[PDB]
């Protein structure tokens, strides 16, 4: 399978999540995603084919994971934006006020701006601290997907937000949306990963 940020993957033939970013760890290929998407050793599938398993995760507290993939997967420095792509150029963290976009299997590619950093989400499983908040909308299934600047600077992977009855926060005004992401920096250092870029 071609690994691009934003596409859908299922976990243990059950839950759906989105790919964050293509990465490597020495000769091992992988992608980073959301910790709540799977437990260590859960099986990841893309289009019905097995592509890898969860190698590690942290959730709650933080919300992060990396899946190591088989050798046959093709890592790409890209994030899906409809039919086109956003090239990954690095991981410079943007500041409050910067515009940002995110891509996921549920709402597609949405952009907004970063409104706050170091936010705590009180999920039913326990708190998740240090999240950054943006007002791009997102829905159930978007978790783990890519947060990136139009310029290609990777920001993080989707964690969660304030959902309405329709399964997303796209029907509410930007001013009231709270879409949270886990910063990428700490996941790269924690797992010793390197981003695939182009």
């Amino acid at each position: 399978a071609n690994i691009v940020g934003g596409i859908e993957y299922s976990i243990n033939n059950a839950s759906l999540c989105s790919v964050g970013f293509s990465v490597t760890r020495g000769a091992t290929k992988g992608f980073v995603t959301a910790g709540h998407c799977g437990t260590v050793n859960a099986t990841a599938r893309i289009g019905g084919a097995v592509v890898g398993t969860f190698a590690a995760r942290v959730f709650p507290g933080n919300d992060r994971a990396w899946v190591s993939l088989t050798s046959a997967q093709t890592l790409l420095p890209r994030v899906a934006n409809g039919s086109s792509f956003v090239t990954v150029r690095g991981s410079t963290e943007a500041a409050v006020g910067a515009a940002v976009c995110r891509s996921g299997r549920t709402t597609g590619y949405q952009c907004g701006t970063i409104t706050a950093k170091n936010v705590t989400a009180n999920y039913a499983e326990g708190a998740v601290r240090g999240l950054t908040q943006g007002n791009a909308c997102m829905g159930r299934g978007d978790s783990g997907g890519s947060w990136i600047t139009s310029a290609g600077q990777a920001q993080g992977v989707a964690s969660g937000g304030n959902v309405q009855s329709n399964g997303n926060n796209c029907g509410i005004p930007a001013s009231q949306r709270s879409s949270l992401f886990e910063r990428l920096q700490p996941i790269l250092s924690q797992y010793g990963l390197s981003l695939v870029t182009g």
């Binding site: 959301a34 989400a121 997102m138 159930r140 978007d142 978790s143 969660g160 937000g161 709270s178 949270l180």
Partner: peptide, 4 residues
């Protein structure tokens, strides 16, 4: 907030 809920996870996703």
């Amino acid at each position: 907030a809920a996870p996703f």
